[PDB]
């Protein structure tokens, strides 16, 4: 039981090192790489307009949250097409080019295969390097081209807000979990741009026109999405941060430009940041128990406010899905902390219930032919950690409930996911390793926990019949 608490601390560190689990190093390889974007290159004008139509239909969420007006986008699009045709420069035009390109790439990542495969041209396949694999390879080619263009035009540029939007528009992809160091560096640059422009002046003032209100609103949405990612993507590879400049929503007892919450606005970006701050206060800062009681009450209240959102269109289902997903995930983390540290009773069953809710949700979103919405990386992080802990306590203890839930999670995740092949493959191999560890422990400073001590030591140094036990260690 004290052993349980200790190995649960070990599992904390082991999940950190779980999650701490090609690109050419030279832009000039893409110096002359063709396009997808010319009239004859890959993607006709009309295909692109269709893509934007689908995007505004299904996935308004992101860029709706950012910009002021969005007929702006087709307007600028057609203007750029006219200018391109006339040319057979400036800053505005190139920025808007990058913006539309990134918008598109997001839409590609969240499209069904058959549609895009019907849209794409043909002989350009002969021109280019070559189911879902075709979709993802063409997506990757488009991504790398956009990345070349945008790296160049990022450095060589004045500071303008729209660069930030690019990153945020692209963070909702495999990108940051496929090109991590790159992403972290550019995130640092975007953080600098954030603090540059004084976007902390979403402090809404008196007698401001509607335009000014909308500007501050855009700033506000931007800031909070940025703080979300900056906490969510904060491995020791990064030490510079912005998630400190906000403040916890907890109303603590034990305690300027540091922004507080509940004093500003109500747009659900705020809600996401609140939830992330609760996770943050769980992880890094003082873990208490009255703290958890208040957090749990507050999170039930916010789950009410989440389900207040009523079904009227795809994007609404998407948002409510992601919010309820986050809420149950954080409840699961809290109740994990409880049942791991202080052994309150029935918390295990009241913890298993959230997992069942999550899995009912993703089942609903497969069965409704919304599998593309499932592909958000946060969902995959979630299933990763869940399967991790469930395998852990399934091998250390027996409960057919746990076996069933874990088997559902892993059968789902294996049978459904190509996209994030490196991460999932590393996780799957080390998971099968832990299953062989089940065979070991099934066949008290145990040698198995000693092997896991060795494993964390291997990782910590990777930062910068004991004979047979070492034998199986070498075997795996």
């Amino acid at each position: 039981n004290l052993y349980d608490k200790k190995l649960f601390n070990i599992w904390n560190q082991y999940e950190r090192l779980w999650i701490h689990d090609a690109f050419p190093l030279d832009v000039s390889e893409y110096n002359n790489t063709k396009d997808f974007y010319g009239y004859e290159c890959l993607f006709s004008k009309e295909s692109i307009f269709k893509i934007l139509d689908h995007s505004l239909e299904r996935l308004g969420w992101l860029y709706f949250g950012f910009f002021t007006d969005i007929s702006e986008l087709p307007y600028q699009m057609e203007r750029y097409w006219n200018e391109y045709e006339s040319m057979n420069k400036s800053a505005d035009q190139i920025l808007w080019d990058l913006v539309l390109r990134s918008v598109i790439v997001m839409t590609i990542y969240y499209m069904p295969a058959k549609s895009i495969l019907s849209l794409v041209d043909i002989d350009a396949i002969e021109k280019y390097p070559l189911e879902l694999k075709k979709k993802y390879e063409i997506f990757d080619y488009c991504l790398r081209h956009t990345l070349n263009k945008v790296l160049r035009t990022i450095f060589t540029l004045p500071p303008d807000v729209r660069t930030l939007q690019i990153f945020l528009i692209l963070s909702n992809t495999n990108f940051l979990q496929i090109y991590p160091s790159l992403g972290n560096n550019i995130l640092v640059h975007c953080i600098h741009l954030a603090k540059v422009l004084g976007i902390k002046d979403f402090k809404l003032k008196i007698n401001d026109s509607g335009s000014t209100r909308l500007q501050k609103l855009s700033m506000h949405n931007i800031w909070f999405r940025l703080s979300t990612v900056d906490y969510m993507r904060s491995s020791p590879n990064k030490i510079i941060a912005l998630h400190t400049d906000n403040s916890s929503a907890l109303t603590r007892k034990t305690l300027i430009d540091s922004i507080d919450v509940y004093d500003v606005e109500s747009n659900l970006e705020v809600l996401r940041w609140k939830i992330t701050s609760l996770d943050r206060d769980l992880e890094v800062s003082e873990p208490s128990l009255k703290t958890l009681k208040a957090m749990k009450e507050l999170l039930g209240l916010l789950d009410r406010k989440t389900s207040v959102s009523n079904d009227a269109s795809f994007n609404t289902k998407f948002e409510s899905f992601f919010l309820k997903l986050q809420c149950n995930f954080v409840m699961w983390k809290i109740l994990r902390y409880e049942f791991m540290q202080y052994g309150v009773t029935n918390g295990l069953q009241k913890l298993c219930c959230p997992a069942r809710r999550i899995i009912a949700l993703v089942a609903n979103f497969l069965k409704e032919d919304y599998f593309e919405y499932t592909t958000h990386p946060f969902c995959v992080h979630i299933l990763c950690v869940i399967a991790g802990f469930f395998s852990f306590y399934c091998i250390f203890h027996e409960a057919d409930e746990v076996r069933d839930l874990r088997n559902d999670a892993v059968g789902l995740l294996k049978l459904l996911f190509d996209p994030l092949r490196p991460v999932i493959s590393c996780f799957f191999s080390n998971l099968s390793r832990l299953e062989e560890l089940r065979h070991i422990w099934k066949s008290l400073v145990h040698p198995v926990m000693y092997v896991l001590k060795t494993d964390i030591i291997k990782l910590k140094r990777n930062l910068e019949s004991s004979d047979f036990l070492e034998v199986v260690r070498e075997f795996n």
């Binding site: 809404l204 003032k205 008196i206 007698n207 401001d208 026109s209 509607g210 209100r213 109303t251 007892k253 305690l255 300027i256 507080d260 509940y262 004093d263 606005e265 109500s266 208490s288 128990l289 009255k290 507050l298 209240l301 406010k305 202080y342 052994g343 309150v344 009773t345």
Partner: protein
Amino acid sequence: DTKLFLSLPIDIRYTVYFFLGDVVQNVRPPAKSDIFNDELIAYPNIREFNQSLVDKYSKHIGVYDYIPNFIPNWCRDFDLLRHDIILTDRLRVCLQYEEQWFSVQWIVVSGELEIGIFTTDEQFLQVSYTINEYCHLLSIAQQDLRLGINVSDINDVNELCKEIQHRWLFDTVSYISFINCWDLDHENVVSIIPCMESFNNLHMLRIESKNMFNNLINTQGVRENPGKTIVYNVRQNIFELELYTLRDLGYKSVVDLQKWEQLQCLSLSGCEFIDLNNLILPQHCKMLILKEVKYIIWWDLSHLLKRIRPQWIINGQVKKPTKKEEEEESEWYNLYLEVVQTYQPLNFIELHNAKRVKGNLILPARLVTESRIKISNGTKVDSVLLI
């Protein structure tokens, strides 16, 4: 039984002890109003009454000594309440969440230090324990703790604690209380004001009297008494605050505390009148806690109530949907912003039952949709509206 009770989880024991707040002794003194009534309850009891404790601890006990047999009761109570495993888990658990129940501070009697655990209302004593006993029961550390000044603990005893946590030990204490000694005098302030330098674990204060408050705190009464008031470096290091027990806070008063900076939470209880329009504050302090008092005078909000139309009003809540009516939309935001700017450095307002508020409540919806505005059923108001 005992071990059956101790084979159980913590929430159970927590709620149980919450129902058993602090009654560990087999007796209780009264409030003040019940004094002049000559009715004494009953305490006919007998010996096992050592003259080692009744003589020692009388500075907090011998005040009363005027009833049926109480001190032998008290004496055997203190004796038997050194072995209640009940109590040890009571304290392990109450400490675990929050000791709003037991008020627990330092004491010295006979020149011998101990740690006493009292009521909260005025801290009638219950028992005490030695530091080594305490942290053999628990883990030893610089476990933050409380302290207050009485006529029992004033100056040399107080300076004895000072020089002991200098010489023998280190200053493991945070929070300071002014429960009596309302005169700003008879050596309490003289002792303590030179003594807040080794005193750097704290953020927290508790105050009693309008005399002591007005003549120490309310910074309009400006003087040049250096040892009579604080050094301002501690005025930085006071993120929390508490105060009780007065009649007329703000009736034509000088209510303003801009010097009292780096404050982050206020607590007020047990009073008889208050108005918030006189109230002025620093920034950084939004947590406001307010307990059972008489009728409150909210902010004015009268002109702003005159600004309003029933164009939009529904169910006590309002909004403009019409983007076309920037006239009405800008007006809406002007209204909302005036509203919050009245409450500007505040985000959390707690009321226990104060029986009345008089001042035309119109509030935001962002906060009452949540539990920021946390009123008990002091439901003697009707002029409610939300934004």
